[PDB]
Design an enzyme around this catalytic site. Structure first.
Site, PDB file in Angstrom:
ATOM      1  N   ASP A  44       0.837  -1.195   0.000  1.00 52.83           N
ATOM      2  CA  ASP A  44       0.000   0.000   0.000  1.00 52.83           C
ATOM      3  C   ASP A  44       0.872   1.246   0.000  1.00 52.83           C
ATOM      4  O   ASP A  44       1.668   1.434   0.921  1.00 52.83           O
ATOM      5  CB  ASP A  44      -0.935   0.037   1.209  1.00 52.83           C
ATOM      6  CG  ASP A  44      -1.859   1.236   1.148  1.00 52.83           C
ATOM      7  OD1 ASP A  44      -2.815   1.199   0.349  1.00 52.83           O
ATOM      8  OD2 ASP A  44      -1.591   2.248   1.846  1.00 52.83           O
ATOM      9  N   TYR A  49       2.987  10.096   0.580  1.00 59.40           N
ATOM     10  CA  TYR A  49       3.911   9.517   1.553  1.00 59.40           C
ATOM     11  C   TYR A  49       5.374   9.861   1.257  1.00 59.40           C
ATOM     12  O   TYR A  49       6.230   9.671   2.117  1.00 59.40           O
ATOM     13  CB  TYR A  49       3.750   7.994   1.674  1.00 59.40           C
ATOM     14  CG  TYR A  49       2.360   7.523   2.084  1.00 59.40           C
ATOM     15  CD1 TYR A  49       1.415   8.397   2.626  1.00 59.40           C
ATOM     16  CD2 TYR A  49       1.986   6.194   1.909  1.00 59.40           C
ATOM     17  CE1 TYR A  49       0.137   7.948   2.968  1.00 59.40           C
ATOM     18  CE2 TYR A  49       0.721   5.745   2.252  1.00 59.40           C
ATOM     19  CZ  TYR A  49      -0.206   6.622   2.773  1.00 59.40           C
ATOM     20  OH  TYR A  49      -1.471   6.152   3.084  1.00 59.40           O
ATOM     21  N   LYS A  78      -2.559   5.980  -4.500  1.00 60.61           N
ATOM     22  CA  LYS A  78      -3.665   6.879  -4.218  1.00 60.61           C
ATOM     23  C   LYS A  78      -3.392   8.257  -4.804  1.00 60.61           C
ATOM     24  O   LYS A  78      -2.268   8.771  -4.719  1.00 60.61           O
ATOM     25  CB  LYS A  78      -3.911   7.005  -2.701  1.00 60.61           C
ATOM     26  CG  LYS A  78      -3.789   5.689  -1.946  1.00 60.61           C
ATOM     27  CD  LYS A  78      -4.209   5.793  -0.489  1.00 60.61           C
ATOM     28  CE  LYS A  78      -3.828   4.538   0.304  1.00 60.61           C
ATOM     29  NZ  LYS A  78      -2.377   4.501   0.648  1.00 60.61           N
ATOM     30  N   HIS A 111      -7.638   9.303  -2.629  1.00 57.14           N
ATOM     31  CA  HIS A 111      -7.071   9.155  -1.285  1.00 57.14           C
ATOM     32  C   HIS A 111      -8.015   9.680  -0.198  1.00 57.14           C
ATOM     33  O   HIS A 111      -8.195   9.032   0.835  1.00 57.14           O
ATOM     34  CB  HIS A 111      -5.713   9.862  -1.239  1.00 57.14           C
ATOM     35  CG  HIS A 111      -4.816   9.425  -0.135  1.00 57.14           C
ATOM     36  ND1 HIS A 111      -3.444   9.505  -0.245  1.00 57.14           N
ATOM     37  CD2 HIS A 111      -5.086   8.934   1.101  1.00 57.14           C
ATOM     38  CE1 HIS A 111      -2.912   9.066   0.883  1.00 57.14           C
ATOM     39  NE2 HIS A 111      -3.881   8.714   1.716  1.00 57.14           N
TER      40      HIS A 111
HETATM   41  N1  LIG Z   1      -5.964   5.762   3.109  1.00 59.71           N
HETATM   42  C1  LIG Z   1      -5.561   6.522   4.148  1.00 59.71           C
HETATM   43  O1  LIG Z   1      -5.992   7.652   4.368  1.00 59.71           O
HETATM   44  C2  LIG Z   1      -4.577   5.910   5.108  1.00 59.71           C
HETATM   45  C3  LIG Z   1      -4.410   6.468   6.371  1.00 59.71           C
HETATM   46  C4  LIG Z   1      -3.554   5.872   7.289  1.00 59.71           C
HETATM   47  C5  LIG Z   1      -2.856   4.730   6.919  1.00 59.71           C
HETATM   48  N2  LIG Z   1      -2.993   4.224   5.666  1.00 59.71           N
HETATM   49  C6  LIG Z   1      -2.219   3.002   5.229  1.00 59.71           C
HETATM   50  O2  LIG Z   1      -2.320   2.024   6.252  1.00 59.71           O
HETATM   51  C7  LIG Z   1      -1.002   1.652   6.677  1.00 59.71           C
HETATM   52  C8  LIG Z   1      -1.046   1.170   8.133  1.00 59.71           C
HETATM   53  O3  LIG Z   1      -1.480   2.221   9.005  1.00 59.71           O
HETATM   54  P1  LIG Z   1      -0.469   3.081   9.900  1.00 59.71           P
HETATM   55  O4  LIG Z   1       0.864   3.220   9.244  1.00 59.71           O
HETATM   56  O5  LIG Z   1      -1.212   4.335  10.209  1.00 59.71           O
HETATM   57  O6  LIG Z   1      -0.315   2.317  11.296  1.00 59.71           O
HETATM   58  P2  LIG Z   1      -0.340   0.779  11.821  1.00 59.71           P
HETATM   59  O7  LIG Z   1      -0.042  -0.212  10.676  1.00 59.71           O
HETATM   60  O8  LIG Z   1      -1.592   0.625  12.604  1.00 59.71           O
HETATM   61  O9  LIG Z   1       0.855   0.833  12.870  1.00 59.71           O
HETATM   62  C9  LIG Z   1       2.204   1.048  12.434  1.00 59.71           C
HETATM   63  C10 LIG Z   1       3.049   1.115  13.703  1.00 59.71           C
HETATM   64  O10 LIG Z   1       2.997  -0.153  14.372  1.00 59.71           O
HETATM   65  C11 LIG Z   1       4.314  -0.637  14.622  1.00 59.71           C
HETATM   66  N3  LIG Z   1       4.290  -2.082  14.500  1.00 59.71           N
HETATM   67  C12 LIG Z   1       4.124  -2.807  13.400  1.00 59.71           C
HETATM   68  N4  LIG Z   1       4.122  -4.062  13.633  1.00 59.71           N
HETATM   69  C13 LIG Z   1       4.292  -4.221  14.963  1.00 59.71           C
HETATM   70  C14 LIG Z   1       4.385  -5.350  15.774  1.00 59.71           C
HETATM   71  N5  LIG Z   1       4.305  -6.610  15.292  1.00 59.71           N
HETATM   72  N6  LIG Z   1       4.568  -5.111  17.091  1.00 59.71           N
HETATM   73  C15 LIG Z   1       4.651  -3.860  17.599  1.00 59.71           C
HETATM   74  N7  LIG Z   1       4.573  -2.754  16.840  1.00 59.71           N
HETATM   75  C16 LIG Z   1       4.395  -2.947  15.523  1.00 59.71           C
HETATM   76  C17 LIG Z   1       5.191   0.040  13.556  1.00 59.71           C
HETATM   77  O11 LIG Z   1       6.541   0.158  14.020  1.00 59.71           O
HETATM   78  P3  LIG Z   1       7.829  -0.096  13.106  1.00 59.71           P
HETATM   79  O12 LIG Z   1       7.495   0.360  11.641  1.00 59.71           O
HETATM   80  O13 LIG Z   1       8.906   0.727  13.750  1.00 59.71           O
HETATM   81  O14 LIG Z   1       8.149  -1.636  13.171  1.00 59.71           O
HETATM   82  C18 LIG Z   1       4.533   1.424  13.473  1.00 59.71           C
HETATM   83  O15 LIG Z   1       4.972   2.288  14.513  1.00 59.71           O
HETATM   84  C19 LIG Z   1      -0.188   2.941   6.428  1.00 59.71           C
HETATM   85  O16 LIG Z   1       1.221   2.729   6.478  1.00 59.71           O
HETATM   86  C20 LIG Z   1      -0.718   3.293   5.039  1.00 59.71           C
HETATM   87  O17 LIG Z   1      -0.127   2.423   4.084  1.00 59.71           O
HETATM   88  C21 LIG Z   1      -3.834   4.780   4.777  1.00 59.71           C
HETATM   89  O1  LIG Z   2      -3.728  10.233   4.644  1.00 57.73           O
HETATM   90  C1  LIG Z   2      -2.959   9.188   4.895  1.00 57.73           C
HETATM   91  O2  LIG Z   2      -2.908   8.196   4.176  1.00 57.73           O
HETATM   92  C2  LIG Z   2      -2.121   9.222   6.141  1.00 57.73           C
HETATM   93  O3  LIG Z   2      -2.014  10.542   6.672  1.00 57.73           O
HETATM   94  C3  LIG Z   2      -1.191  11.433   6.008  1.00 57.73           C
HETATM   95  C4  LIG Z   2      -0.051  11.014   5.334  1.00 57.73           C
HETATM   96  C5  LIG Z   2       0.785  11.960   4.740  1.00 57.73           C
HETATM   97  F1  LIG Z   2       1.875  11.563   4.103  1.00 57.73           F
HETATM   98  C6  LIG Z   2       0.494  13.320   4.797  1.00 57.73           C
HETATM   99  C7  LIG Z   2      -0.649  13.725   5.471  1.00 57.73           C
HETATM  100  C8  LIG Z   2      -1.494  12.796   6.085  1.00 57.73           C
HETATM  101  C9  LIG Z   2      -2.747  13.281   6.777  1.00 57.73           C
HETATM  102  O4  LIG Z   2      -2.730  14.305   7.448  1.00 57.73           O
HETATM  103  N1  LIG Z   2      -3.876  12.577   6.549  1.00 57.73           N
HETATM  104  C10 LIG Z   2      -5.136  12.980   7.150  1.00 57.73           C
HETATM  105  C11 LIG Z   2      -6.045  13.735   6.161  1.00 57.73           C
HETATM  106  C12 LIG Z   2      -5.656  14.075   4.858  1.00 57.73           C
HETATM  107  C13 LIG Z   2      -6.535  14.763   4.009  1.00 57.73           C
HETATM  108  C14 LIG Z   2      -7.805  15.131   4.458  1.00 57.73           C
HETATM  109  C15 LIG Z   2      -8.201  14.801   5.762  1.00 57.73           C
HETATM  110  N2  LIG Z   2      -9.438  15.158   6.232  1.00 57.73           N
HETATM  111  O5  LIG Z   2      -9.646  15.065   7.430  1.00 57.73           O
HETATM  112  O6  LIG Z   2     -10.279  15.559   5.446  1.00 57.73           O
HETATM  113  C16 LIG Z   2      -7.311  14.116   6.600  1.00 57.73           C
END
Ligand SMILES: NC(=O)c1ccc[n+]([C@@H]2O[C@H](COP(=O)([O-])OP(=O)(O)OC[C@H]3O[C@@H](n4cnc5c(N)ncnc54)[C@H](OP(=O)(O)O)[C@@H]3O)[C@@H](O)[C@H]2O)c1
Ligand SMILES: O=C(O)COc1cc(F)ccc1C(=O)NCc1cccc([N+](=O)[O-])c1
Length: 316
Positions: A44, A49, A78, A111
């Site tokens: 993803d 990012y 995205k 996104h």
């Molecule tokens: N569409 C959107 O708006 C949106 C928004 C947010 C996220 N996303 C996507 O979703 C992905 C996942 O969400 P996220 O990055 O917000 O957070 P997450 O996957 O819920 O948590 C990531 C955190 O958990 C830690 N971690 C991972 N595996 C672990 C384990 N086995 N034990 C303990 N800690 C662990 C990682 O540390 P380390 O990396 O240091 O190991 C990091 O600090 C994002 O990276 C992105 O690709 C999309």
């Molecule tokens: O949006 C993601 O995937 C994770 O969060 C971010 C990652 C980045 F690299 C940069 C910014 C964000 C972030 O602030 N994302 C949060 C966000 C974005 C756009 C609009 C809203 N909204 O509330 O409408 C929220």
């Protein structure tokens, strides 16, 4: 059980993928290489990012090494908010393709439903810190996404952070050509999303759960915030199953027929997090985890709360 879920475009999507938000550019190449080595086939990504070039280096190396074939990978990116205009969508997609060193994406998502003024800044602000909106609506942006399918740049299109009314708007679009394949939304035991999930699933839209571990590395984290990985109730379920708390948190959405995308740059955790296909949470475990809902949302911005398409005023 089964490793992939069938999308409404006829393609199969791996239910476990690697997240890359916050993965430092100097670490993410090795993270993705390790992930592919230990079985991940879904990554993803997003332009916002700022690490797609480095993700791409890893993908390209593993393809060149013949560790995997391109058809076996499922690469997601995205469209950022400053590219909602119809004349900008193709170029945004092409920049992502060039960075990832791919000739197509498996899935490309809007996104966020909120369009912002185009320009260099990812969050253009007025003097009082409100985001400056674009006047381009989600339906016209959707039409631009459909064109990407018809040009061969992407195999599937979808949405992210769309509320149920926004999903409905797309589904009711006059002349809709392709339904969204996926809605990627925040989902974990503190934000269980039952209403939005049921709605999307009832329409044949696959839901991807982001921040499944509660995003403990989110930059706006506060000390007083709840912590999934440290919740003794979840630790107890993990202990009963002889698994880690993270493994339970990843298995949970899988059993709800969701795709899940935990992020790590730590090689041991990348491997750990993939070892989730050989145990089952009971119905009772599932209902217990669902009971922890507190509508705690980690991914939202104050700067966007007056945007006409801000998604989180609505209940779901
Ligand atoms: N569409 C959107 O708006 C949106 C928004 C947010 C996220 N996303 C996507 O979703 C992905 C996942 O969400 P996220 O990055 O917000 O957070 P997450 O996957 O819920 O948590 C990531 C955190 O958990 C830690 N971690 C991972 N595996 C672990 C384990 N086995 N034990 C303990 N800690 C662990 C990682 O540390 P380390 O990396 O240091 O190991 C990091 O600090 C994002 O990276 C992105 O690709 C999309
Ligand atoms: O949006 C993601 O995937 C994770 O969060 C971010 C990652 C980045 F690299 C940069 C910014 C964000 C972030 O602030 N994302 C949060 C966000 C974005 C756009 C609009 C809203 N909204 O509330 O409408 C929220």
């Amino acid at each position: 059980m089964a490793s992939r879920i069938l999308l409404n475009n006829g393609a199969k999507m791996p239910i476990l993928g690697l997240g890359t938000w916050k993965s430092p550019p100097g670490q993410v190449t090795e993270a993705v290489k390790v992930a592919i080595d230990v079985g991940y086939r879904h990554i993803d990504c997003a332009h916002v990012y700022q690490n797609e070039n480095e993700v791409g280096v890893a993908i390209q190396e593993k393809l060149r090494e013949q560790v995997v074939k391109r058809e076996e990978l499922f690469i997601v990116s995205k469209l950022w908010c400053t590219y909602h205009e119809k004349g900008l969508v193709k170029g945004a997609c092409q920049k992502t393709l060039s960075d990832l060193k791919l000739d197509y994406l498996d899935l490309y998502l809007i996104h966020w439903p909120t369009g912002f003024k185009p320009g260099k800044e990812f969050f253009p602000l007025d003097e009082s810190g409100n985001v400056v909106p674009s006047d381009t609506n989600i339906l016209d942006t959707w039409a631009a996404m459909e064109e990407l399918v018809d040009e061969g740049l992407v195999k599937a299109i979808g949405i992210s952070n769309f509320n149920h009314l926004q999903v409905e708007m797309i589904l009711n679009k006059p002349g809709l050509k392709y339904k969204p394949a996926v809605n990627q939304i925040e989902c974990h035991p503190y934000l269980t999303q039952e209403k939005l999930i049921q709605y999307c699933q009832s329409k044949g839209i696959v839901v991807t759960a982001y921040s499944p571990l509660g995003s403990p590395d989110r930059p706006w984290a506060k000390p007083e915030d709840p912590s999934l990985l440290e919740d003794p109730r979840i630790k107890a379920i993990a202990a009963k199953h002889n698994k880690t708390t993270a493994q339970v948190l990843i298995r949970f959405p899988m059993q709800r027929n969701l795709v899940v995308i935990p992020k790590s740059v730590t090689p041991e955790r990348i491997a750990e997090n993939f070892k989730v296909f050989d145990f089952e949470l009971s119905s009772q475990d599932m209902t217990t985890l669902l009971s922890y809902n507190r509508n705690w949302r980690v991914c939202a911005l104050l700067s966007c709360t007056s945007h006409k398409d801000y998604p989180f005023h609505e209940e779901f």
